[model samples]
Target: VPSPYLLSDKEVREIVQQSLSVGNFAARMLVRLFPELFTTENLRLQYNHSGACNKKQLDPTRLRLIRHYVEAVYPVEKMEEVWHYECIPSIDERCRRPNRKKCDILK
Candidate 1:
């Protein structure tokens, strides 16, 4: 069977910001296609550890996966057009720097 390819704008936005919990159709499909990223390390984001804390996830692997997944659905050109979104750092930027204080996509 085929995995989900259909995507919505809000879904893309949330995933970009690492604001989404890792238990949706998108997350499942990502694991299904590329398990390597997850198995190598303990993956935790906004909702992990039973949501004990709001530990933000800005790992390289997840960033790359997010990069790939984002590019898969939307072209770079389209991303450039959004005002509030363009300020939301590029995936490549976070992937390389692994820094904090990324702009909020949902904000």
Candidate 2:
């Protein structure tokens, strides 16, 4: 189970290192800009629920990072909203297979 907040100096360094290693420069910047987003026992758990049925479901840890990201940069009233709507962008048909769109919403 994931914690609700990011605790410990080790966790802070790990988060920063991972974000940078993953080519998430924007996330790294967000962490720096909003230090409160990554305190132990504080990363919201509500954002971990992915809508997918398979392992392809977004990983919970990653989702926490994303939650922190949006909170840091955007104005959100609550974490529950992230689960209510799709934040991932839809794809265009031109880049998709004959019958599939590049980013169609699963129904």
Candidate 3:
């Protein structure tokens, strides 16, 4: 039973401190930049899945909304800046960079 925004502060933090922490990104940047928006009682609007089936997680569907929530609200560069500033070493990365040149266009 996942809602658009029911994940609490403590729930968000717990997601951050785990290994292979699935679905942390949606929780991480969202909560960090705007706390109290998604409270235990009710989310204050201004909102926000993933699939993976076979014993999937709740917010994967929740993340489906939340991940896109930040897309309009947060610029990639700003989030990228926060990614490094926090020292998580989790930037989506080098070879996979969309900002990078494609194919033989560089050569």
Candidate 4:
């Protein structure tokens, strides 16, 4: 079945930041789909000891997985005039790197 939870990179990043900004719901939902990221290394050790992963406690793997999943599920759309208006500039700026262009769509 198609995953209802699947999201584009832009959407995933937005959700991740939103999760951090609001609460744990978005992060929790994303992690449920990609548990391996959370189940690795220090995070796993911490989870074993603490019995839970918090909103602010995401590891590199979790972050990478979120990006990877988004990249995999969504294709990158061409940079176009429409992109300038539709894309979330603040989110793209805050979350994205200085070298990266914010106009590219998450496929």
Looking at candidate 2, the ten consecutive residues that score lowest on lDDT are 86-95
Q: Give me the runs in candidate 1 sitting further than 4 Å from their true place.
A: 1-25, 33-58, 74-107
**Backbone atom clashes (below 3 Å) for every candidate:** 0, 11, 3, 2
Q: Write down the lDDT of every candidate, Cα atoms only.
A: 0.50, 0.46, 0.48, 0.49
What's every prediction's RMSD, in angstroms?
A: 15.4, 15.6, 13.5, 14.4
Ranking by lDDT: 1, 4, 3, 2
Please list the residue runs of candidate 2 whose C-alpha ends up more than 4 Å from where it truly belongs after superposition: 1-51, 76-107
Write the number of the candidate with greater lDDT, choosing between 2 and 4. 4
The TM-score of candidate 2 is 0.22
lDDT of model 1 at position 21? 31
Better of 1 and 4 by lDDT: 1
* Ranking, TM-score, top scorer first: 3, 4, 1, 2
Task: For residues 1-107, write the lDDT of model 2, one tens digit per residue.
Answer: 56746454444444544553333644564455445546775442222246444423334665566556445533322234444443322233344546754467563
Query: How far in Å is the alpha carbon of 48 misplaced in model 4?
Result: 18
Candidate 3, residue 47: how far the Cα is off, in Å:
22
Q: Give a tens-digit lDDT track for model 1, residues 1-107.
A: 34467445556655544524324435654654445546747453333323346664344565476556655644432455553465555655666773444575335
The best candidate by lDDT is 1
TM-score of candidate 4 on Cα atoms, chains taken together = 0.23
Please estimate how well model 2 matches the true structure, expressed as its whole-model Cα lDDT.
0.46
* Residue 106 of model 1, lDDT score: 36
Predicted structure with the largest TM-score when compared to the true one: 3
